[PDB]
Amino acid sequence: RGYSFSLTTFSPSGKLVQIEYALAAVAGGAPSVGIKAANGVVLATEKKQKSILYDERSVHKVEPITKHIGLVYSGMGPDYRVLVHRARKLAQQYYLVYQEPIPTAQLVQRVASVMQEYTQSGGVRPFGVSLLICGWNEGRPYLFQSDPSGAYFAWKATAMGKNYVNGKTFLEKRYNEDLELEDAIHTAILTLKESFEGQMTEDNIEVGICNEAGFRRLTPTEVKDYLAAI
Template identity: 35%
Template sequence: MLPAAAGYDRAITVFSPDGRLYQVEYAIETVRRGTLAIGIKSKDGIILAVEEKPRKLQNSDITQKIFQVDDHIGVAAAGYIPDARSQVDNARFFSQSNRMIYDEPIEVEAVAKHLADQAQQYTQYAGVRPFGVALIIAGIDKSGSTIYLTDPSGTYISYDAVAIGAGADQVTEFLEKNYKKDMSVEDAAAMAIESIYLVSEEKDGTKHIKMAQIPIATKQLTRTSEKDIEQFAVKAKDNIAKRPK
């Protein structure tokens, strides 16, 4: 980088002459280098799926990238996961406070906006750095099924299906071609696994895949068992075999 641009590179609160905040862009690049996370909305629920690459002796029973905020809200993260834990703790406190004050479950958009506002605050003050993580915030409230994406810049956008992390552009293209709003939650789960296989080094097995779902019938986030993930993977492989090469 040229010496003239070095100051803008180091200072989080200063725009470069071409209107960029370099530290925010670096944080977004951290997200792009993280392993894949996916959120897919179906007619009867929401699927959150992530790729995790555990070490050989690591206990893989604990999911590192999927979190529960409230009974009806889950989060999948890509990027610097310790930052995700910090934001999720904030979201849990915010959600619990809403229940105590208003005696009702919080709306998904309120959580997404709250976390996006927090991320934006970390882009404009000296002495802090942007969060190096993007979050898929999914849940079912009185307005129905909702998925939001937040990123280090403080943006939050609603999606029917979204992917973040390494290979997200390729997966997004795949989802744009194949996603259908009237698909079942089982079809959505198979599509999520198919998306992970699309960009992962591991094209077989399910040990590197973690998943959670929020059915409309219960509005309760549940972790998907390894046995169920294996069944969805069989369906995903059938779908891969049927797709034109």
């Protein structure tokens, strides 16, 4: 049982062939924006299903890691769910040994640590989910993104998934360092509104904020509320 040989390896050019394919599988994923704001963040994403047939209260893409840290993805479906499982477990190891909710930076350390050995270690392919992190952690909010390589960077705004160059350029245009509450939600909504493939339905987007009282998903009556206030 098992293989115990790495399938991720170095090209003759000198680069990882599987990781750039993982960033291709991320770049073919659903678009998701994340905006660091002066008191709190907003992590919006786009839930377009096949038909109007499914339960849009069944699966989530905003979902917390146990205290005040939500994380949203773009790319492969269930590999995300594995990273939520591992991330909740690592946050609870940290909580049972140090008796505080985990600093966001350390959670990104350990999630980027567990995503690294799937670029090695016996036949496993890398995850191909570049999920991004939020978190209030004391004083000022944080935001990160763990690539399927294992790198991570903190910033003020980003996008990912489909056509993310337009998201990074557009958020580079419209960002202010004091831009703080629901205005961030506003520009997040008009970053997903940029493509969306049509009509901007409230059941096809969900956002999550970290407004100094724990990460919480937004109820579907609140997104449609600001979709009435467009």
